[PDB]
Design an enzyme around this catalytic site. Structure first.
Site, PDB file in Angstrom:
ATOM      1  N   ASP A  12       0.917  -1.129   0.000  1.00 50.39           N
ATOM      2  CA  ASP A  12       0.000   0.000   0.000  1.00 50.39           C
ATOM      3  C   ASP A  12       0.963   1.185   0.000  1.00 50.39           C
ATOM      4  O   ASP A  12       1.593   1.448   1.014  1.00 50.39           O
ATOM      5  CB  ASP A  12      -0.873   0.006   1.276  1.00 50.39           C
ATOM      6  CG  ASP A  12      -1.640   1.298   1.552  1.00 50.39           C
ATOM      7  OD1 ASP A  12      -1.543   2.234   0.742  1.00 50.39           O
ATOM      8  OD2 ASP A  12      -2.314   1.381   2.600  1.00 50.39           O
ATOM      9  N   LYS A  73       3.213  11.396  -3.624  1.00 50.70           N
ATOM     10  CA  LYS A  73       2.037  10.821  -4.275  1.00 50.70           C
ATOM     11  C   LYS A  73       1.099  11.919  -4.832  1.00 50.70           C
ATOM     12  O   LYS A  73       0.375  11.663  -5.794  1.00 50.70           O
ATOM     13  CB  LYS A  73       1.306   9.883  -3.301  1.00 50.70           C
ATOM     14  CG  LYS A  73       0.355   8.910  -3.993  1.00 50.70           C
ATOM     15  CD  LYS A  73      -0.168   7.894  -3.017  1.00 50.70           C
ATOM     16  CE  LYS A  73      -1.532   7.420  -3.405  1.00 50.70           C
ATOM     17  NZ  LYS A  73      -2.046   6.427  -2.419  1.00 50.70           N
ATOM     18  N   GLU A 177      -7.040   0.948  -4.616  1.00 51.44           N
ATOM     19  CA  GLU A 177      -7.116   0.870  -3.154  1.00 51.44           C
ATOM     20  C   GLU A 177      -8.495   0.362  -2.667  1.00 51.44           C
ATOM     21  O   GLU A 177      -8.505  -0.613  -1.904  1.00 51.44           O
ATOM     22  CB  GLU A 177      -6.756   2.217  -2.514  1.00 51.44           C
ATOM     23  CG  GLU A 177      -5.270   2.539  -2.568  1.00 51.44           C
ATOM     24  CD  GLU A 177      -4.908   4.012  -2.485  1.00 51.44           C
ATOM     25  OE1 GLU A 177      -5.735   4.816  -1.996  1.00 51.44           O
ATOM     26  OE2 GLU A 177      -3.788   4.362  -2.922  1.00 51.44           O
ATOM     27  N   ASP A 201     -12.928   5.733   3.236  1.00 43.11           N
ATOM     28  CA  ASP A 201     -11.490   5.907   3.460  1.00 43.11           C
ATOM     29  C   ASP A 201     -11.140   7.286   3.979  1.00 43.11           C
ATOM     30  O   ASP A 201     -11.035   8.228   3.191  1.00 43.11           O
ATOM     31  CB  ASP A 201     -10.743   5.614   2.146  1.00 43.11           C
ATOM     32  CG  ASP A 201      -9.213   5.582   2.195  1.00 43.11           C
ATOM     33  OD1 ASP A 201      -8.635   5.905   3.268  1.00 43.11           O
ATOM     34  OD2 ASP A 201      -8.589   5.225   1.157  1.00 43.11           O
TER      35      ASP A 201
END
Ligand SMILES: Nc1ncnc2c1nc(Br)n2[C@@H]1O[C@H](CO)[C@@H](O)[C@H]1O
Ligand SMILES: [Mg+2]
Length: 390
Positions: A12, A73, A177, A201
């Site tokens: 992850d 990211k 994800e 999330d």
């Protein structure tokens, strides 16, 4: 005849934290790093003598802000002119430069000014996750599945693959994800029939809701919604402002201009926030916070819940938009899945459960580990090379 194959890993690669897992003996093992942490900060620090990755990078950020890189990211596969990039740069202490309309991070490293592409920084984080896995398995690791957010475009997905290739990994697949979180619960193994799954999330800096449909193990992303300005850091900011005011009332001193005292206060607030997820109250004990004054105080869960009340309630707005976009009613959702450490907050769970009229939430797999868990399950499936019997 045929030598035993090394296990494949599931990574992850997160914005703030990364996690690595391996599926062995019919179960997933989330691997702790050398400091005993099951998650590793996605931080890379540069000095005159070393390159530090993970916990060693994050622990020295206070005195080295210009040469410690985090949030790569948010830059990966994007153009320098992108409005998302231009806004984020105002919040970062490190320099982001323009190289052919592609962002690069520029730092001081081993006596020179060096610029790196976001994929190169991400490859350094992937190199650390590969080493954590090899420390546990006791042999070299080659194969991995890496996860990305469902909203990532082709360029962002290709740059993630490029980071894996630079790190010496064979990238088996780039998976979404929310799909990895669903796989962690075996939601693709329930047989014939359609199931609607909502993935909630809540991260350190962002909130994402995804609605997936699963039919005979086939996944389809039906809707995505979220809030780029909602996460764990905003709950920490509310506590910080609360304790700055409390110090002002009690000692008649404003501490907001001593960076060390603010940082010590914020670090203590983030830990108090975590204690409040399991306890009804938490203590705050800082020695010589400002002008040799010790700050010893407490915060109840009820007061913390009041301080962040508007923020927690605002998580339901992307839930309702995602349901409208997917053309579904809340009663039509079969499974609710929790992702991210901020989902451990009892009030967040209560609000969502109440919104879905008392339904149970899948939270048995640690929410900070569910994505890597699913990626490890997928990695073991992708390397099977069984030959059919007669
Ligand atoms: N038990 C927990 N209760 C409340 N919050 C938590 C917990 N554990 C984690 Br981890 N967090 C927060 O999740 C975010 C992950 O990027 C950070 O803001 C952490 O503070
Ligand atoms: Mg994540």
């Amino acid at each position: 005849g045929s030598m035993a194959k090394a296990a494949a890993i599931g990574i992850d690669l997160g914005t703030t934290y990364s996690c690595v897992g391996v599926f062995q003996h019919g179960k997933v093992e989330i691997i702790a790093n050398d400091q005993g942490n099951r998650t590793t900060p996605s931080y890379v620090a540069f000095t005159d003598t070393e390159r530090l990755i993970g916990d060693a990078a994050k622990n020295q950020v206070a005195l080295n802000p210009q040469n410690t890189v985090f949030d790569a990211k948010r830059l990966i596969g994007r153009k320098f002119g992108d409005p998302v990039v231009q806004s984020d740069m105002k919040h970062w202490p490190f320099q982001v430069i323009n190289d052919g309309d592609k962002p690069k991070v520029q730092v001081s490293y081993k006596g020179e000014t060096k610029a790196f592409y976001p994929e190169e920084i991400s490859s350094m984080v992937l190199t650390k996750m590969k080493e954590i896995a090899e420390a546990y398995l006791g042999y070299p690791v080659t194969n991995a599945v890496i996860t990305v957010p469902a909203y990532f475009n082709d360029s962002q997905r290709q740059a993630t693959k490029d980071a894996g290739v630079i790190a010496g990994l064979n990238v088996l697949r780039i998976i979404n994800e929310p799909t990895a979180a669903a796989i962690a619960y075996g939601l693709d193994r329930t047989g014939k029939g359609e199931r609607n799954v909502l993935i909630f999330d809540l991260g350190g800096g962002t909130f994402d809701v995804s609605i997936l449909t699963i039919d005979d193990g086939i996944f389809e992303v039906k809707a995505t919604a979220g809030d780029t300005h909602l996460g764990g850091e905003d709950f920490d900011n509310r506590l910080v402002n609360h304790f700055v005011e409390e110090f002002k009332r009690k000692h008649k001193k404003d501490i907001s201009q001593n960076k060390r005292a603010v940082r010590r206060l914020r670090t203590a607030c983030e830990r108090a926030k975590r204690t409040l997820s399991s306890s009804t109250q938490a203590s705050l004990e800082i020695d010589s916070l400002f002008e040799g004054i010790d700050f010893y105080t407490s915060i109840t869960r009820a007061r913390f819940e009041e301080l962040c009340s508007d923020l927690f309630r605002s998580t339901l707005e992307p839930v309702e938009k995602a349901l409208r976009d997917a053309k579904l009613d809340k009663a039509q959702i079969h499974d609710l899945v929790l992702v991210g450490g901020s989902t451990r907050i009892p009030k967040v769970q209560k609000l969502l459960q109440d919104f879905f009229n008392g339904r149970d939430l899948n939270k048995s797999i640690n929410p900070d580990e569910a994505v890597a868990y699913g990626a490890a399950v997928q990695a073991a499936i992708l390397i099977k090379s069984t030959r059919a019997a007669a």
